[PDB]
Amino acid sequence: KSKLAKPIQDLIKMIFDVESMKKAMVEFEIDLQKMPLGKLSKRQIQSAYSILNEVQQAVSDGGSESQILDLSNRFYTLIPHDFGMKKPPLLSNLEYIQAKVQMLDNLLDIEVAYSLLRGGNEDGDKDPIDINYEKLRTDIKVVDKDSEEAKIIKQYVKNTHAATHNAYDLKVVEIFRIEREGESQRYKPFKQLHNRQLLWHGSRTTNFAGILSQGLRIAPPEAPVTGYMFGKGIYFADMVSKSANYCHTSQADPIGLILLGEVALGNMYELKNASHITKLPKGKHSVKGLGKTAPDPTATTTLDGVEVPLGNGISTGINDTCLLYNEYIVYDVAQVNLKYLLKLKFNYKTS
C-alpha cells in the first residue's frame, strides 16, 4: 500500500487521471480517433508551433491566400482535428491562431504526464501511487490548516478575489508545501534581488505533472512571440481570481489546483498596454502590466522574507490602462521558486 498521506494520494491520482487528459484534448477539438494520447510526440508539437509561427507572419504581412491555405492544411494534417459537421476553419484569423498556440502549450504538459504514466512502473513492493509520486521529483508535504502559513495563505485567497469574478466562490480544500528537486539551487542567485513577492499561477489539472517534474516553463523558440500578451515569459497575478480563471473548472468539474510561487521581480518594467517584449530594457528584471484594481499596499505582509500582497482589492489610480488586474512576467525560468500548491473547490453560484 501507499506510504503517503491521503490528500497527497488523492492529489497524485488527480494529476495522473487519464480521462481528464482525453477530456482536455477533446475540448481542444483534437480527433482522439486519429490522434490517440500515445501519439503525442515532442517533435510533433515543435513542428506545429513553427507552422503557427509562419502562418501568423503571412496573416500579418498580407501573404498569398494560397500560402495560408497550404499552412492550414499542413497544421490540421499534423494535428488531426474533429469539427463535427462543421467546415474546418482556416488559420486566417489572428485570434484563432493564438488559441492554437495555447493548445500546444497545454499539449506539451499533457505529453509529459502520459510519458511518465507509462514510464517506469515495474515493482510489486511499491504501490502504483508511490511510484508515480517519485516520478515527480518533488517533495510534497501537507501544510497544517492551523499554522500561520495556512492562515496567511487563506487570507491571501479570500481578500484578493476580484469583483468581476463573482461567478463563483473559492474554498481552499488543501494546501501543500512543494519543493522541486534542484529548484532552490537554481533560484539561489535571485535571492539577491529586491522586490521578491509570493504570486499566483493557475493552470489545468492536466498540466501539473509537467509543471511538477519540469517546473514552470517558457514557450520554445518556435512559438510565435505574438501568441502571448507580453512575450514569451512566465505569467503571474496578485489577484487569486485572475489566476483561478485559468484552472478551467466548471460546475461539472469544480476542483482546481493553483500554485503560489516566490518570484524575483527586481526593478519592474511597468506597462499599460500589450507589448511583444523580445528583450528587457537594461536595468529591468521583469514586466508589470498595470491594472485598475490591486491588493491594498497597506496590508502587504511578509512570509520568510517574501512579500505577500494579501491586501483587499483597491482601485490603483491608473485610468489609462488596458488591464483590469496586475500581471507579472519573468523571462527566465530561474527567477521562480514554487512554494505551495493549493487544491481549490469552486463553488459556482446557481440556477
How many CA atoms are closer than 13 Å to the CA of 329, on its beta-carbon side? 23
Binding region = 201-203, 210, 217, 243
Give me 274's grid cell: 500589450
CB–CB of 216/261 below 8 Å?
yes
Q: Tell me how many helices (H) and strands (E) the chain has.
A: 10, 14
Tell me the C-alpha distance between 320 and 164, whole Å.
19
d(C-alpha 67, C-alpha 201), whole Å: 37
Alpha-carbon distance of 344 to 157, in angstroms, equals 10
> For the sheet containing 301-303, what is the strand order?
138-142, 168-180, 336-348, 255-264, 196-202, 306-308, 301-303
Among residues 183, 262, 307, 327, which one is catalytic? Answer: 327
Binding site per annotation, positions for NAD(+):
201-203, 210, 217, 243
Residues with Cβ within 8 Å of 215's Cβ and at least 6 positions away in sequence, in order, are 180, 183, 333, 336, 338
Number of Cα atoms under 13 Å in the Cβ half of residue 338: 28
In 10 A of CB 43, how many CB atoms? 7
Q: Hey, what domains does the chain have and what are their CATH numbers?
A: 1-136 (1.20.142.10), 137-349 (3.90.228.10)
- Helix crossing, 128-135 with 94-117: angle to 10°? 130
Extract long-range pairs of 29-34: CB within 8 Å, 24+ residues apart: 29/81, 29/82, 29/83, 30/79, 30/80, 30/81, 30/82, 31/80, 31/81, 31/82, 32/82, 33/82, 34/80, 34/82
Cα 305 to Cα 326: distance, rounded to the nearest angstrom:
22
DSSP, collapsed to helix, strand or coil, labels residue 272 as coil
For this structure, is 327 an active site residue?
A: yes
Q: How was this structure determined?
A: X-ray
CA–CA gap between residue 340 and residue 263 (Å, rounded): 13
Tell which residue, 242, 244, 211, has the closest CA to residue 336. Answer: 211
